[PDB]
Design a binder for this molecule. Structure first.
Ligand SMILES: CC[C@H]1CN(c2nc(-c3cc(OC)c(OC)c(OC)c3)cnc2N)CC[C@H]1C(=O)O
Ligand SMILES: [Cl-]
Ligand SMILES: [Cl-]
Ligand SMILES: [Cl-]
Ligand SMILES: [Cl-]
Ligand SMILES: [Cl-]
Ligand SMILES: [Cl-]
Length: 246
């Protein structure tokens, strides 16, 4: 695997994320460009570990890693992976916010189902749940990727556990429905205050009582009252078509 095996089409974001084309079969992919020139041997060893871990993750709802390419000349490491043509959930939400248009319940259910399964897989093996780390492919599939900011999704436990991940999922699904997170504040201390009270607005009325109910359960103050991944997926809301399809 050499860089010359691929051709950069253009830069998606900025190290650098680029949409690329594999020359042999024309397959569309992306790579993440990492300049390791300024790294110590220690940090490079830490980098080697991380990349090996990504190679082991095979799941329909986790962004698929394909390859790693070393360019010793430019001291650049390339991580090759699947392309998610639908971009990230952050952009979907800001888009709904600016166009004043709520997302379909069907879409929210797809995200709930598919991220819950990604989470289930993560818990098996041993990756923050936030809109910017959730990607959409071209087939309605949902995939989990990998100081200044306010920690909107921090659970009550953390500010003091797999149920903690359930809280964060609740926050993400809440924000998808309401187009704002369940707890907002100008500082972290004000934020922490709101989280401890555990009160928030119901998601918009266009969304079913059943969907409101499960999101609300995920946001319970007590970790042990939050549903497990198993209890989530048992929900009558969740159907075959909400799962991944090739
Ligand atoms: C490469 C590192 C990242 C991001 N990543 C992928 N991102 C995109 C992607 C596509 C977009 O529009 C077509 C887009 O604009 C909204 C965008 O915004 C951030 C991202 C497509 N495919 C990807 N594989 C993969 C996961 C992730 C990581 O760090 O592991
Ligand atoms: Cl899939
Ligand atoms: Cl609105
Ligand atoms: Cl709807
Ligand atoms: Cl309450
Ligand atoms: Cl409301
Ligand atoms: Cl669980």
């Amino acid at each position: 695997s050499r860089a010359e095996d691929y051709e950069v089409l253009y830069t998606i974001g900025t190290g650098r994320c680029q949409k690329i084309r594999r020359k042999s079969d024309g397959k569309i992919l992306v790579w993440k460009e990492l300049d390791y020139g300024s790294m110590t041997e220690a940090e490079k060893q830490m980098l080697v570990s991380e990349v090996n871990l990504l190679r082991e993750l095979k799941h329909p709802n986790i962004v698929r890693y394909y390859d790693r390419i070393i360019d010793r000349t430019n001291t650049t490491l390339y991580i090759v992976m699947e392309y998610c043509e639908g971009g990230d959930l952050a952009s979907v939400i800001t888009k709904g916010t600016k166009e004043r248009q709520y997302l379909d319940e069907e879409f929210v259910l797809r995200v709930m189902t598919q991220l819950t399964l990604a989470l289930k897989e993560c818990h098996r093996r041993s990756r923050d749940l936030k809109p910017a780390n959730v990607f959409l492919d071209g087939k309605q599939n949902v995939k989990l990727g990998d100081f200044v900011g306010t920690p909107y999704y921090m659970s009550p436990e953390q500010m003091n556990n797999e149920k903690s991940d359930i809280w964060s999922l609740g926050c993400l699904l809440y924000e998808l429905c309401a187009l704002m997170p369940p707890f907002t504040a100008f500082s972290q201390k004000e934020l922490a205050g709101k989280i401890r009270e555990g009160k928030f607005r119901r998601i918009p009325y266009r969304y079913s009582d059943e969907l409101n109910e499960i999101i609300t359960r995920m946001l319970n103050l007590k970790d042990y009252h939050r549903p497990s991944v198993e209890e989530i997926l048992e929900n009558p809301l969740i159907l075959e078509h909400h799962h991944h399809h090739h």
